[PDB]
Amino acid sequence: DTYKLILNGXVLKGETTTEAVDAATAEKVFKQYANDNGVDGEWTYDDATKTFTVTE
């Protein structure tokens, strides 16, 4: 499936997508991308939209 990532860094925002077989795998990809790019914070998932948010 296509999963989405919302990255909220206070006044700064971003977003991205990945293809993955399930949600746990997409989150591993999203958590590495977020961390590689300086974005650390609280994670939540909307399984109705297959969208993760990381909030600084």
Residue numbers in the entry: 1 to 56
What did the original publication write about this model?
However, to have a better control over the turn conformation, we decided to introduce a type-II′ β-turn. Through subsequent X-ray crystallography and computational analysis of synthetic GB1 proteins with amino acid substitutions at the i + 2 residue of the β-turn, we show that amino acid side-chain identity and its rotameric conformation have a direct influence on the strength of an n → π* interaction. Gratifyingly, the thermal denaturation of the GB1 proteins shows a good correlation between their stability and the strength of an n → π* interaction at the β-turn.
Thus, to obtain a quantitative estimate of the n → π* interaction energy (En→π*) at the i + 2 residue in 2, 3, and 4, we resorted to NBO analysis, which clearly indicated a decreasing En→π* in the order 2 > 3 > 4. An overlay of the type-II′ β-turns of both the β-branched amino acids valine and threonine revealed a clear difference in the side-chain rotamer conformation. Valine in 4 crystallized in a gauche− (g−) side-chain rotameric conformation, whereas threonine in 5 crystallized in a gauche+ (g+) conformation. 5 with the strongest COi+1 → COi+2 n → π* interaction displayed the maximum stability (TM) and 4 with no detectable COi+1 → COi+2 n → π* interaction showed the least stability. We were surprised to note a very good correlation between the TM of these proteins and En→π* between COi+1 → COi+2, in the absence of the stabilizing COi⋯HNi+3 hydrogen bond.
